[PDB]
Amino acid sequence: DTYTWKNARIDGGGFVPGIVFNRSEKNLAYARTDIGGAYRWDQSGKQWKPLLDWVDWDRWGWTGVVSLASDTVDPDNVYAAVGTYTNSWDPTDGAVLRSSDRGASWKAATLPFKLGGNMPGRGMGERLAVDPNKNSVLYLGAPSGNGLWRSTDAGVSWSEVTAFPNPGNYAQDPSDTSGYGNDNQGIVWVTFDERSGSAGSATQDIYVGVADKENTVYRSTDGGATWSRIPGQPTGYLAHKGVLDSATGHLYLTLSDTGGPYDGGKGRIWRYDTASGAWQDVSPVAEADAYYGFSGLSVDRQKPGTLMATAYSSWWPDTQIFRSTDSGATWTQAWDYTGYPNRSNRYTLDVSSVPWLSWGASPAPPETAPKLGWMTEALEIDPFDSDRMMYGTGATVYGTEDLTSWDSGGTFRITPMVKGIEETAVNDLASPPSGAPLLSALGDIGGFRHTDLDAVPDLMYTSPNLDSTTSLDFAESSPGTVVRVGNSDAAPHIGFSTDNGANWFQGSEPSGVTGGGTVAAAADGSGFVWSPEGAGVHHTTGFGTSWTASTGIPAGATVESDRKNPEKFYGFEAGTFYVSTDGGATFTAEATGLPAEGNVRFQALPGTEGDIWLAGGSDTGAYGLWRSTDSGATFTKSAGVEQADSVGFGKAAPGASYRTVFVSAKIGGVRGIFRSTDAGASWTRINDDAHQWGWTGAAITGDPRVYGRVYVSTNGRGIQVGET
Ligand SMILES: [Ca+2]
Ligand SMILES: [Ca+2]
């Protein structure tokens, strides 16, 4: 057919570091994510629409969005600063993407440096800003010593503001040699005082946040020609945000002892009088009582003197949200102790639309399930409705529509406002021939038995509730039997089910397991092979009540089961394929000369013993698609596929003699998702240029019950379901 694409519905699942309301047009808003692109708000549907699904495999780094700006002068314009890592993990430089149709189409201005959409400090901002009087002028705060950058042609071209005196010097984790935690977080927000410009004339007063505990805020009063450190400013902290109440003339800084978004153990809120230069400590709590940093800063644009902030890094018992209606002289908070451990809330929290946010937890007071939140760097009051606010957490977007009930001494209602955001990273996917259509393995929220692809599942896997599921499998001939492995701070790292994943019980494990690795289920459900991180390959008869070390197979090998012969298991490591014919007790080395470097994914064919498809490799070594029909003794490399990364199967086409094969691959010079109904003799692309989703290499499977349907992994855009 032509294909249509949709998410298997989950609602959220990831960190939303920034939410942006346009300051001139009611109900125009956007959200940015750290690995999953950017979204525009749909008021009529109370949902979000993805804007960057066109970002392709070779430019996957552009799915990280470190900043977004919505033009107040011309609300049709929106800009996004993109790029994911500044170390070797992201091979492409950053860019500023520009749109003049609210994100429907984009052009890219590539920068000569990398950006950090998924790096420490990504919750600070916004560091991309448009001049609110002369909207051809934009600024971008840059990391890694690149300083402050500027465009004077509406984002088409960029150069460094060499007069800016401080490129930053703060790093989260200086001992890190990987480049992930030791980067200079640089310039972290830019805020204009729109009172200091006029239509078509550059705004003269510009405020800039810098990741430097001794010099965290600078300003210009001559339109960015010269810059100076603001005298009298607080020291010892990083300003996560700088927001100006133009009605009272006060600039507010929410400060933290770290760059966030995960850490922060101390904080203040300080206030600067832009007319007199006075500084005042307006913190909601005393320095000695702040065990967290502040962020989540927002001013009510319709109510001068009203503002809010968050304890963004308060992990226990909950996050905290503060509100002042007198410019920070006095505050109240969303919840209080009323004689510890008892607590009183100014809100009710209702997650019936996203029930898994309970986390399956049953905490004692003062902790609640669900929680008010965590990692709350983003909090925004609707500039056109004092009764609405939205805030981001590490798993969702929450909001309320009766916020001013707070001031009345009443109770306001908080619900998810996240529908449409699909932000999970997918590790594995399985579609069994009976039971639910899909079992997913996900980062951060474990994964789900999806009984309905169009409905939010009630709860993630529990007993155990793993942070991330790295691998799952089902018994081909007995799909009631399922196994999953994954990551957690504590053992157990493995769970079993005999009711198709609806309910679970833990397995035991060998000592030294540090992560899930991969797991495989015997075709008859009688036993399992587990290749964990931190320990070697083990096998078990029964539901992992004890494990025995497998011989003849390298630690860390990728393991799979035959789908027909319950005694036959497979392994792959460093270019060598391994086979076991005794339930995983002993392996022998078989085919060699497979990719020695790079990711590999492989799966055996439902219905046929010893028919194996194997995809993988890398840009700098062997790369392609291989097939064996002799249980891995020999493989043939497909002449039709230049590169391939994931491979999986679904129901045969009408009249076809072989199951349908799906791959994420590069075929005939084109990266995409492809389908074959003639056992790989020919291929058809089934996605398109608008539906690419960056790195789709983790997993793919068809559906044994539905011809043409495919489930595709993404790294930040959830589970993509393609249907003809
Ligand atoms: Ca360290
Ligand atoms: Ca699997």
TrEMBL record:
Keyword hit for Metal-binding: yes
Q: Does the keyword Calcium apply?
A: yes
State where Ca(2+) binds: D428, L472
Q: Which UniProt keywords apply?
A: Calcium, Metal-binding
Q: Which domain of life is it from?
A: Bacteria
What is the name listed in the Swiss-Prot or TrEMBL entry for this protein?
Cellulose-binding family II
What is the originating organism of this protein? Answer: Streptomyces sp. (strain SirexAA-E / ActE)
Q: What is the lineage of its organism?
A: Bacteria, Bacillati, Actinomycetota, Actinomycetes, Kitasatosporales
Full-sequence range covered = 68 to 791 of 926
